[PDB]
A paper describes a structure:
We found that the Tm values of [name]-T189M, [name]-[name], and [name]-T189M-[name] were increased by 3.0 °C, 4.5 °C, and 4.8 °C, respectively. After incubating these proteins with trypsin for 45 min, the wild-type [name] completely disappeared, while some intact proteins remained for the three mutants, especially for [name]-[name] and [name]-T189M-[name]. The stability of the system is obviously improved by the [name] mutation, and the captured structure is almost stable in one conformation. In order to reveal the structural basis for the higher thermostability of the best two mutants, we solved the crystal structures of [name]-[name] and [name]-T189M-[name] at the resolution of 2.50 Å and 3.76 Å, respectively. Comparing the structures of [name] WT, [name]-[name], and [name]-T189M-[name], it can be seen that the angle of the α helix between L408 and T419 shifts, which is in agreement with the MD study. However, in the crystal structure of [name]-[name], a loop in this region turns to a helix, indicating the effect of stabilization. Furthermore, the loop region R314-L316, E208-F210 and C398-Q401 in [name] WT change to a β sheet in the two mutants’ crystal structures, also indicating that this region is less flexible and more stable. In wild-type [name], there is a hydrogen bonding network between S195 and D187, S193 and L199. Moreover, weak hydrogen bonds formed between S195 and L198, as well as Y319. After mutating from S195 to M195, the hydrogen bonds involving D187 and Y319 were removed and new hydrophobic interactions formed between M195 and L199, as well as V331.
Residue numbers in the entry: 20 to 488
Write the structure that this text describes.
Amino acid sequence: TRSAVVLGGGMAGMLVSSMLARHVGSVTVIDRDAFPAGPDLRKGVPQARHAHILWSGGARIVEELLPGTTDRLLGAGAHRIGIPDGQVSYTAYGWQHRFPEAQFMIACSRALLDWTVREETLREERIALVEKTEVLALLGDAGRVTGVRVRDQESGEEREVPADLVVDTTGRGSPMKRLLAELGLPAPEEEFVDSGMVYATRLFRAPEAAATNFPLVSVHADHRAGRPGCNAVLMPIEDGRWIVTVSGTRGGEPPADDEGFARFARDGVRHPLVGELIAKAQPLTSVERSRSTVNRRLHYDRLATWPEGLVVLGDAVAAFNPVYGHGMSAAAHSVLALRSQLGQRAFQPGLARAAQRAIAVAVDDAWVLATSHDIGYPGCRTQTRDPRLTRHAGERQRVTDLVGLTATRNQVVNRAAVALNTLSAGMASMQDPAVMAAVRRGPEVPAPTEPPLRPDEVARLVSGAGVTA
Ligand SMILES: Cc1cc2nc3c(=O)[nH]c(=O)nc-3n(C[C@H](O)[C@H](O)[C@H](O)COP(=O)(O)OP(=O)(O)OC[C@H]3O[C@@H](n4cnc5c(N)ncnc54)[C@H](O)[C@@H]3O)c2cc1C
Ligand SMILES: [Cl-]
């Protein structure tokens, strides 16, 4: 009984289709893009060309909704990288000591992750993916949405798709503002923090002995310094390749050419470790850039009038600067918020409004983590009403900077630090007396003077060829 229509077949659309199919009779996914039969790039997801980090918070939710996805991803060549044991990060406060595993992350190409999730989601026959179809209008009125009017691209014909619930997961380019204006409702309050961050990505062939078991390598900017923030990340992906992403805010954007790419990885960031590593490897692709790095939040939950049976989640409601890697995990938490409101209110009046408020809560942690670090950079453009970002930004920063500094050299503080940053625990977990006691206990290890690389890791950066003696 009952039917749902999900707009957009990306990450959030697939995950919320898996969830909705367990609560309604049929789910119809509407997308304007063409979908490949294998782990391929497509025009509807241009961000798949760049490095994608799936934190434990998102991966655990994906595993719950689609059991077997993690093992399937690992079987295809993905890497399970422990945190912080398997990471080499020059943090804003110094090198992070590689304590034993507290959290984890999944490392694969975004194309492989999207194809794997879609294959598992579409095993349920009651979910239908309708490709290359435009979204014309929402059916119903400003009091209740009753479906969507769509148009096939090949024919141009228009049809009505009825639904008891319409979920918008069309991503950053969501047309929900227009779709709502044609419904008569005003525009939602728009919050954004624009640092001008620009991505630049190249693919590399890892040295043979390092195709397996290699750590995530990241060189971070110092968000407290008054210089443009530049980052460099090296992430192993399937099939023995390395995806290398460099980034910079306004006034320090990475170049588009191959020559300048390696120079940026060596001298554009605070430590040349990534630049040193890529020169052990064969480049495979040219530089591809992205400018989709604005933290943007649409407050649909606070509109005076909100229609029944209409829900927005994913990048359509809250997008973030990707250098913090919370986008996919935030959408996963949003899907669970909707699932929580379905278990509580079923399809009674008030579900859509209650779902929109829980979705706003579910993304607030990722929003704060991204925007609190982005506002400091030179040339930043901010439009906000949040006192955390405005009035109380100085006091909140003096505490996180103290937490972050201690987290590089204290295991229990690091435990809470990575639990929050992987979106596996809430903000309140940082106020537990057992964490603030460890912050007051100070460091338990010396600040590393070198990249905390393991000797067996660096040994696998060379073939060992040409030696017979
Ligand atoms: C460069 C970059 C790097 C990132 N790195 C990370 C990372 O490491 N970790 C992380 O967690 N997140 C990362 N993100 C964020 C993550 O990619 C997004 O948050 C995530 O894709 C959100 O899922 P979504 O389904 O809402 O959007 P998408 O995955 O983009 O899905 C959009 C879908 O809707 C369709 N669509 C779009 N417009 C319309 C329309 N008008 N009508 C119909 N269909 C439409 C598209 O064809 C597509 O299928 C990164 C983003 C970028 C740009
Ligand atoms: Cl992009």
